[PDB]
Design a binder for this molecule. Structure first.
Ligand SMILES: Nc1nc2c(ncn2[C@@H]2O[C@H](COP(=O)(O)OP(=O)(O)O)[C@@H](O)[C@H]2O)c(=O)[nH]1
Ligand SMILES: [Ca+2]
Length: 144
């Protein structure tokens, strides 16, 4: 059974933990391992948060401009650590259930395009896009 080691990075308070708990325990309110079938393949998702992960969720919150601006720092670190320019990763805009949006989707898309990675909006609260975020990351790992 294939095992994907996933890392979630981003400013504190963006919902990294909430996203993980929503994926694993299916609810909104230290490593994690969930067995799941993705595209017919039975696999094991190992969510840490580098050192060394196979895929990285770069998370910010759409109601938090600074967390968005900090994303670049996080990716640069990952690139240095992995000694590579092409690391499987997804840009995640969390808390999309909130009305106080200060980061437009277009902004994140442009950033993601510059990185050559997908952008997905999530809500650990409503569960919107959570599975899609992690699953999409796995599919990015499979292309690598
Ligand atoms: N409304 C809303 N709140 C969220 C969402 N994700 C996380 N939160 C809240 O944001 C706060 C900090 O989230 P947390 O997971 O601890 O951030 P972390 O530092 O990245 O782990 C908590 O009170 C969460 O309930 C979301 O998608 N929507
Ligand atoms: Ca917390």
């Amino acid at each position: 059974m294939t095992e994907y080691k996933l890392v979630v990075v981003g400013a504190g308070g963006v919902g990294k933990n909430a996203l993980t708990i929503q994926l694993i325990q299916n609810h909104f309110v230290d490593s994690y391992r969930k067995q799941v079938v993705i595209d017919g393949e039975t696999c094991l998702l190992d969510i840490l948060d580098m050192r060394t992960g196979e895929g990285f969720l770069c998370v910010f919150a759409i109601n938090n401009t600074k967390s968005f601006e900090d994303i670049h720092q996080y990716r640069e670190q990952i690139k240095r650590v992995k000694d590579s320019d092409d690391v499987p990763m997804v840009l995640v805009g969390n808390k999309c259930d909130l009305a106080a949006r200060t980061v437009e989707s277009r902004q994140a898309q442009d950033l993601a395009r510059s990185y050559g990675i997908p952008y997905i909006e999530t809500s650990a609260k409503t569960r919107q896009g959570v599975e899609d975020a992690f699953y999409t990351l796995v599919r990015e790992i499979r292309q690598h």
